[PDB]
Design a protein around this motif. Structure first.
Motif, short mmCIF file in Angstrom:
data_model
loop_
_atom_site.label_atom_id
_atom_site.label_comp_id
_atom_site.label_asym_id
_atom_site.label_seq_id
_atom_site.Cartn_x
_atom_site.Cartn_y
_atom_site.Cartn_z
N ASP A 97 0.82 -1.36 -0.07
CA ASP A 97 0.07 0.07 0.18
C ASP A 97 0.88 1.30 0.03
N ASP A 137 -1.49 4.50 7.73
CA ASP A 137 -1.20 3.72 9.18
C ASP A 137 0.01 4.05 9.65
N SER A 188 -4.18 -3.30 7.79
CA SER A 188 -3.99 -4.02 6.39
C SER A 188 -3.02 -3.40 5.40
N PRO A 189 -2.21 -4.59 5.12
CA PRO A 189 -0.91 -4.20 4.30
C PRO A 189 -1.11 -3.87 2.80
N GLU A 214 2.73 -5.59 9.17
CA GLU A 214 1.28 -5.14 9.64
C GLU A 214 0.24 -6.06 9.91
N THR A 219 -5.88 2.03 6.84
CA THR A 219 -6.83 0.88 6.98
C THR A 219 -8.20 1.15 7.46
N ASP A 228 2.35 2.73 2.64
CA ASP A 228 2.45 3.47 3.65
C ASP A 228 3.79 3.61 4.45
N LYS A 252 -4.32 -1.60 2.72
CA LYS A 252 -4.60 -0.33 2.80
C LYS A 252 -3.98 0.84 3.19
N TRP A 253 -3.57 1.61 2.28
CA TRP A 253 -2.68 2.91 2.69
C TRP A 253 -3.11 3.24 4.22
#
Ligand SMILES: [Ca+2]
Ligand SMILES: [Ca+2]
Length: 675
Positions: A154, A210, A197-198, A163, A203, A156, A200-201
């Motif tokens: 993602d 994140d 979530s790996p 994550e 989550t 982040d 979702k930039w």
């Protein structure tokens, strides 16, 4: 202080298990072993490291690079190898992507002593200054110059493995470490376990990553709890009216006549409408204090108001538009505020204007073009009869203060709007409304799995017990979940139809019969709607506390600090004081005949909260500013409470204005000779 390169230290040889993810302000990419306290010394040996970011020269020149271990490093400038000791050119004010890898098999010591050097043309070597170093572009898109390119799907910044397994952050010097969660070390130290979530930039699908949340690289006004990757950060706004002024309006048919005016305080609750609903509109109900012209007239009202932001994120350059409504759906007015022209921020758990400044008038004293708010004759009666108005409010909140990785500052970002985010938030989180605070409805939203959408698979598991801890501050001092010393069992649960069938199917599957005893095992789903309320109180259809049980109310008035023919001075709990709309006082003679001292429905306002937080009930008010005359020490002095829900706000059909028929609650009864 916010800038420098980003670094991944790994305890294995090939960048698989990262032990520390952190940033260094200068070319000093060392971590001393004494900052690795919360890593066992079994892990403090790093066989590899990766660093990434940008360099910005402040003066064009021909530079040479070099590290503390050139025989272990490979360095890239703009995907161009430079190490494995030569030269290269660097134009002023232009950024260069840097990647440095390092591998040493079997280090003989803990931590890492590593430094990055450049030598200019006058031949001065150096550890690179801070002003020449910048972080990677850890956003979902790219800026014109920063291009972003150790699995980090993602982007982040937090690697994928961390994550998913879990991680914590420890605030070192001013610099933040990010490490895998180890049960025996951080359980003792009380540190927080994180998952996210790996893919979702962000989550919770809000405007902060994140990584931005767990390192402090974020707007300072985001609520402390929305700094959790799984607790969504969004504004939530309703309008609070404080008092009102009705008036006979100027007819086009002598404007030096006397004045005719009604000026009463009001109370506004933010509402929710039920079994919880799926609606995400902002709304509040106003109740107009009920106690002390002709059929072709028109009256007009003015009122003082403040915006209230009970969400978890700030609003900067737009306040939402509001409808002032009478009865079911008659808009009397609209309430806008000029864009980009706000006098301050509207912060979470906070007002606008701030409680120290004056409130906003609906027709400002100085403002030529404010619309007169007007009702016709029948509308006025509809209002006198209900003494209730509504305030609906849209979710147009304007732009977002996002973080900039280039300068490391947080500024309002004209490309970010809240309207691009609220829908994504609402679609992918379970929602909890909880009134444990001041019997005030507070919303929060937690990332939850959606077991029918493939992406939400990689999201973390969210129990109900955990959601209450991280979103509302519930803790368990003795294996007993509570919120500010009230056990969880003192609050009830409610759900929408769908969530309710879900949770019921869950208890069945756990062969559990009581939810309070398997909270840690009840799971949350996207689109769940959960209501949670104090059991002591009765609630109307808007989930506003409007009463209590008689016994609850009697026990509450049991602590009588003092009494006389001038009043009682009690110690009533703040929450109880909130659902009583008045007191009746009567002298009961010895044959049981009753004389009511303040015998009228608009005269029950004799309570009042003295400075010290104790309540006093004034017998003198409606007894002629006198004390009570008990013509016989055996006569009784009774006092009852009326709850909001039993308070009557008009004379009756037949025209009775007495307290005859009002449902009261006996809270004190003594004889003359006991007073
Ligand atoms: Ca990631
Ligand atoms: Ca993530």
């Amino acid at each position: 202080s916010s800038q420098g390169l980003l670094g991944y230290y790994f305890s294995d040889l090939n960048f698989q298990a990262p032990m520390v993810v952190t940033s260094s302000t200068t070319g000093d990419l060392s971590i001393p072993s004494s900052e690795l306290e919360n890593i066992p010394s079994e892990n403090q040996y790093f066989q590899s490291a990766i660093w990434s970011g940008f360099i910005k020269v402040k003066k064009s020149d021909e530079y040479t690079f070099a590290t503390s271990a050139d025989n272990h490093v490979t360095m890239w400038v703009d995907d161009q190898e430079v190490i494995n000791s030569n030269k290269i050119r660097l134009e002023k004010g232009r950024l260069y992507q840097i990647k440095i890898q390092y591998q040493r098999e079997n280090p003989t010591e803990k931590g890492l002593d590593f430094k990055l050097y450049w030598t200019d043309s006058q031949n001065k070597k150096e550890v690179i200054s801070s002003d020449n170093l910048q972080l990677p572009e850890l956003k979902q898109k790219s800026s014109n110059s920063r291009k972003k390119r150790v699995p980090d799907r993602d982007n982040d910044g937090i690697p994928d493995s961390l994550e998913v397994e879990g991680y914590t952050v420890d605030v070192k010097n001013k610099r933040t470490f990010l490490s895998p969660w180890i049960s025996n070390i951080h359980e003792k130290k009380g540190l927080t376990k994180y998952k996210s979530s790996p893919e979702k930039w962000s989550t919770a699908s809000d405007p902060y990553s994140d990584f931005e949340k767990v390192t402090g690289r974020i707007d300072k006004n985001v609520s402390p709890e929305a700094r959790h990757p799984l607790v969504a950060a969004y504004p939530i706004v309703h309008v609070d009216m404080e008092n009102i002024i009705l008036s006979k309006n100027e007819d086009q048919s002598n404007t030096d006549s006397q004045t005719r005016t009604i000026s009463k305080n009001t109370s506004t609750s933010r509402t929710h409408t039920s079994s919880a609903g799926f609606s995400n509109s902002n709304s509040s109900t106003v109740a107009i204090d009920h106690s002390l012209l002709n059929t072709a007239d028109t009256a007009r009202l003015n009122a003082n108001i403040r915006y209230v932001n009970t969400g978890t994120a700030p609003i900067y350059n737009v306040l939402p538009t509001t409808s002032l409504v009478l009865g079911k759906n008659q808009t009397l007015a609209t309430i806008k505020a000029k864009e980009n022209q706000l006098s301050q921020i509207l912060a979470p758990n906070n007002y606008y204007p701030s409680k120290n400044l004056a409130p906003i008038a609906l027709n400002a004293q100085d403002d030529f073009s404010s619309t007169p708010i007007t009702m016709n004759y029948n509308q006025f009666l509809e209002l006198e009869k209900t003494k209730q108005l509504r305030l609906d409010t849209d979710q147009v909140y304007g732009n977002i203060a996002t973080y900039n990785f280039e300068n490391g500052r947080v500024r309002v970002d004209t490309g970010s709007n809240w309207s691009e985010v609220l829908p994504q938030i609402q679609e992918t989180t379970a929602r909890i409304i909880f009134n444990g605070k001041d019997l005030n409805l507070v919303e929060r939203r937690i990332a939850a799995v959606n077991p029918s959408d493939p992406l939400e698979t990689t999201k973390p598991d969210m129990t109900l017990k955990e959601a209450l801890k991280i979103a509302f501050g519930f803790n368990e001092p003795n294996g007993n979940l509570q919120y500010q010393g009230k056990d969880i069992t003192e609050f009830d649960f409610n759900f929408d139809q769908q969530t309710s069938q879900n949770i019921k199917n869950q208890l069945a599957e756990l062969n559990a019969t009581n939810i309070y005893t398997v909270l840690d095992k009840i799971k949350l789903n996207a689109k769940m709607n959960i209501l949670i309320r104090d059991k002591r109180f009765h609630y109307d259809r808007n989930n506003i506390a409007v009463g209590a049980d008689e016994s609850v109310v009697k026990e509450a008035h049991r602590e009588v600090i003092n009494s006389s023919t001038e009043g009682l001075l009690l110690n009533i709990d703040k929450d109880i004081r909130k659902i009583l709309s008045g007191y009746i006082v009567e002298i009961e003679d010895t044959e049981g005949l009753k004389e009511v001292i303040n015998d009228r429905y608009d005269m029950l306002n004799i309570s009042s909260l003295r400075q010290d937080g104790k309540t006093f009930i004034d017998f003198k008010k409606y007894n002629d500013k006198l004390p009570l005359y008990i013509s016989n020490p055996n006569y009784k002095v009774n006092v009852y409470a009326v709850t909001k829900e039993n308070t009557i706000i008009n004379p009756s059909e037949n025209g009775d204005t007495s307290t005859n028929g009002i449902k009261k609650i006996l809270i004190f009864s003594k004889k003359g000779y006991e007073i």
